[PDB]
Amino acid sequence: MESLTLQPIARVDGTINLPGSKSVSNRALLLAALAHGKTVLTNLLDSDDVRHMLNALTALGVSYTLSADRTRCEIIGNGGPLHAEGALELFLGNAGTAMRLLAAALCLGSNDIVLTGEPRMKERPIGHLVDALRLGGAKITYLEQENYPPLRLQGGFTGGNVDVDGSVSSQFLTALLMTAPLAPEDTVIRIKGDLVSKPYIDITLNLMKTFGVEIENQHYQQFVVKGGQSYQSPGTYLVEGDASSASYFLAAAAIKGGTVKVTGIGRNSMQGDIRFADVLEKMGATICWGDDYISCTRGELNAIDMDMNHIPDAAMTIATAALFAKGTTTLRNIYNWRVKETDRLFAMATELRKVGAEVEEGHDYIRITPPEKLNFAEIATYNDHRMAMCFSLVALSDTPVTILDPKCTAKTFPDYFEQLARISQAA
Numbered sequence: 001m002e003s004l005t006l007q008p009i010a011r012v013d014g015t016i017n018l019p020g021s022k023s024v025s026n027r028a029l030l031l032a033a034l035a036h037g038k039t040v041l042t043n044l045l046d047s048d049d050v051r052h053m054l055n056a057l058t059a060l061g062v063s064y065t066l067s068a069d070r071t072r073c074e075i076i077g078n079g080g081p082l083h084a085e086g087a088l089e090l091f092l093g094n095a096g097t098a099m100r101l102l103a104a105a106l107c108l109g110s111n112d113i114v115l116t117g118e119p120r121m122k123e124r125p126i127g128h129l130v131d132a133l134r135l136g137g138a139k140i141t142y143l144e145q146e147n148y149p150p151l152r153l154q155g156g157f158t159g160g161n162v163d164v165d166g167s168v169s170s171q172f173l174t175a176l177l178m179t180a181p182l183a184p185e186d187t188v189i190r191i192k193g194d195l196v197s198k199p200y201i202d203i204t205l206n207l208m209k210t211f212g213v214e215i216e217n218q219h220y221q222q223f224v225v226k227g228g229q230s231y232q233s234p235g236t237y238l239v240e241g242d243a244s245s246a247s248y249f250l251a252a253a254a255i256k257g258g259t260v261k262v263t264g265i266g267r268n269s270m271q272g273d274i275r276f277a278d279v280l281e282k283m284g285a286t287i288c289w290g291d292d293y294i295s296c297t298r299g300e301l302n303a304i305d306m307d308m309n310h311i312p313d314a315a316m317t318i319a320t321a322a323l324f325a326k327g328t329t330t331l332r333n334i335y336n337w338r339v340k341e342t343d344r345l346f347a348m349a350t351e352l353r354k355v356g357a358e359v360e361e362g363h364d365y366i367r368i369t370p371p372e373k374l375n376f377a378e379i380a381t382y383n384d385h386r387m388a389m390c391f392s393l394v395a396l397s398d399t400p401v402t403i404l405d406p407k408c409t410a411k412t413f414p415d416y417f418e419q420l421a422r423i424s425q426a427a
């Protein structure tokens with residue numbers, strides 16, 4: 001078991017040029033593959049989740065080239081739905097963005113493809129998306145547990161009236177939205193009840209528009225999509241820096257700055273996680289907004305009690321930043337933390353207690369009361385990049401922290417620790 005030990009960080013200050021957004025990267029790659037023309041993506045993220053999407057596109061016959069640092073990609077669009085037969089197996093690691101998006105997209109036409117991944121992915125739900133795709137005509141078989149990957153896709157999605165449950169993942173709706181335009185018939189997608197992670201739907205619509213397709217959004221309750229459309233290459237497209245990856249560095253300044261500036265995202269970003277900066281401001285930090293940067297400067301840090309359904313990923317960063325805040329912090333309406341890389345409510349509560357906090361693990365919330373002083377712990381990371389990145393913040397105290405399996409950060413941010421070190425100062 002590999003591990004890394006972080007020594008106490010006296011102060012953080014500096015500038016980080018962010019790695020590309022995983023959310024934007026995977027949507028842009030799939031749309032580029034489906035589109036007509038050559039798309040050149042710049043600032044693309046090089047991480048496991050994007051690599052699995054790239055490998056899937058390669059297996060499906062899509063041609064592309066990558067720059068030396070794998071952040072520039074020139075994709076030759078397929079000019080329509082992707083195809084493969086012979087039950088071609090696509091291994092997608094634990095990349096939900098690739099699993100959910102491809103599960104829908106590959107239902108267009110005829111195909112015979114199997115989507116699978118790492119053991120944890122076979123435990124992450126996909127039944128709501130499968131139910132919706134079937135209502136639209138798709139033939140999908142669960143090869144192991146009902147409602148979970150692996151899936152055998154045999155095509156047939158033609159459109160029509162499709163209901164989709166939006167209470168567990170917004171990715172199911174995203175996948176349907178990206179797929180429906182290329183179906184032969186028009187599709188009316190109706191959301192059954194609640195919709196979680198709503199801001200990611202805006203990312204999806206933004207990318208679709210970039211690639212030439214718009215739909216009718218009726219207050220996020222129903223979406224009307226015209227079929228028979230085609231995606232078109234936007235030419236050169238700049239992938240925004242990752243706002244979720246930015247959270248650690250902005251939080252580090254809120255705790256131990258100094259001023260930390262992240263570049264690649266700014267006030268105009270489409271990512272909902274830029275709203276993480278607003279939470280730091282509510283806790284007492286100072287935030288500055290630019291066209292291509294967001295910066296945070298240390299002020300004070302007070303506990304907050306907030307519904308975090310709009311920023312589920314970056315919200316994990318508040319759970320460890322809470323160790324440094326005055327008072328008890330409560331993060332609410334985050335049930336789906338339980339169905340992601342690991343059950344994050346169980347994992348976060350378990351590891352936070354190890355450094356001294358008193359924690360109430362609610363069914364869909366977490367309440368954190370910090371200790372007077374943190375203690376050393378060897379942190380388990382549950383094959384979850386964010387557990388490693390969130391707990392790295394423990395080193396902004398007087399105690400070192402040991403992080404198990406630090407390479408798990410590669411799911412979205414291979415160079416995380418070197419970037420944290422870049423802004424770590426001894427004086």
Ligand SMILES: O=C(O)C1=C[C@@H](OP(=O)(O)O)[C@@H](O)[C@H](O)C1
Pocket residue numbers: 022023024097168169170171174196197200312313336
């Ligand atoms: O659509 C996307 O790019 C994502 C949506 C979110 O998932 P849920 O909608 O399941 O919360 C988020 O947690 C994931 O990292 C990326």
Ligand SMILES: O=C(O)C[NH2+]CP(=O)(O)O
Pocket residue numbers: 094095096097313340341386412
């Ligand atoms: O990035 C995260 O914090 C959670 N990602 C879930 P996925 O992208 O695998 O569906």
